[PDB]
Amino acid sequence: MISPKKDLEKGVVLSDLCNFLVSQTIQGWKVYWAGIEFDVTHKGMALLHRLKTNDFAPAWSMTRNLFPHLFQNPNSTIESPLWALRVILAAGIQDQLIDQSLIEPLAGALGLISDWLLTTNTNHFNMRTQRVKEQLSLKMLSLIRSNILKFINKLDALHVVNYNGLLSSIEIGTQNHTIIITRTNMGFLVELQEPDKSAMNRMKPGPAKFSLLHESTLKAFT
Amino acid sequence: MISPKKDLEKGVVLSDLCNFLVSQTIQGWKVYWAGIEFDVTHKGMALLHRLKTNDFAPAWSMTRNLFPHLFQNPNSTIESPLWALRVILAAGIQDQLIDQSLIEPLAGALGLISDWLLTTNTNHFNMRTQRVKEQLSLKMLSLIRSNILKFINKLDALHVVNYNGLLSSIEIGTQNHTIIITRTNMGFLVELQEPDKSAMNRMKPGPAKFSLLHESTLKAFT
């Protein structure tokens, strides 16, 4: 009976993809999504808040000056590392959602999941256009998993911010946002801007949300 | 929201642990259990059947003479590589969780799952009695997963059968069986005997089941 075909598969896949499980640890959080464990920490978050102040705390002076649209912008707000993880996961899905045929239901199913991760803070997503729940399969879940792993490795291939021409950030457009992920000495700065990146208008900065994903979270995937 | 409490968490963990999802592939099967993907092949199974006959492999006779309780035993049967994987997963739970500290929390929940994997061919286990179900949490699913990985690494540390000092097999006792896993040139020979290993009584051989897990399946975890 493990061999003959069934509804059980779509059910398990639905459960893994439409739930973002979070468990508190001393260090931060354990997260479980798509059958993948992530260890998220809140180290580094205090420094982020520090940099939002004018406390001159030198040596980080450079970092704040590299990201004035984040640290010197009354319209930018700090989110938690859990949000940072959600944004990176949405970005990974998008970065391999973009090349899909307008099938569309599978691309639609991915878009729904990506959208839920990116723009909400809930632990559960109710997909009920179930012409896409039947787009849910173990094949689709495997594809999502391998491509999340591929995206995480792309991030690990980034160099820390530099003046040596070496790539240090990735930008991903979504339907209603621009996602930017930049490797810094603090870890990965994850930001969410408008599609026009108005936060970058140094004379009159638009809105942004940002946070930090500590290097340790990606190290497990190497 | 992602920060509430835990009927959702328990459902997801239950779904991953009590379902053994299988999709057929050209080379064999894709398996999904406990949020882990396994790629199983039936490459090598024809050779097992050949060895169950007389002659056809003078070069394999040395490998073959190590296992007369398997290849020269009318009470031994060849099972599929899927069975081999289930036996290894059951062995991993037994060896790395049930047999170390006397798990309370609950050895019982682990014991039920292990028993289902080991002795049935079904895709789903209906865990009843609502206090083994509530012993299910993301913590512990995490524990089950890391200990499966450690057991797989233990298998990968085994040497192929040899006449030097080198360890090539692991034996694990369970409630009603003996599990033996031996690394050979063919891959991992997985066998299931009675607790007294009656299959090894050469004049009056008891029953045994066995199969082969190709090296490739474990290599993915390194």
From Swiss-Prot, chains A, B:
Changing residue 178 to I: In strain: Isolate guinea pig-adapted. Transmembrane segments: none annotated. It is found in: Virion membrane; Host cell membrane; Host endomembrane system. GO terms for biological process: symbiont-mediated suppression of host innate immune response; symbiont-mediated suppression of host JAK-STAT cascade via inhibition of STAT1 activity; symbiont-mediated suppression of host type I interferon-mediated signaling pathway; viral budding from plasma membrane. Changing residue 128 to A: More than 90% loss of interaction with host KPNA5. Keywords: Host cell membrane, Host membrane, Host-virus interaction, Inhibition of host innate immune response by virus, Inhibition of host interferon signaling pathway by virus, Inhibition of host STAT1 by virus, Interferon antiviral system evasion, Membrane, Viral immunoevasion, Virion. One of its GO terms (cellular component) is virion membrane. InterPro entries: Filo_VP24. Interacts with host importins KPNA1, KPNA5 and KPNA6. Interacts with host STAT1. Interacts with host KEAP1; this interaction activates host transcription factor NRF2 by blocking its interaction with KEAP1. Belongs to the filoviridae membrane-associated protein VP24 family. This is Membrane-associated protein VP24. It comes from Zaire ebolavirus (strain Mayinga-76).
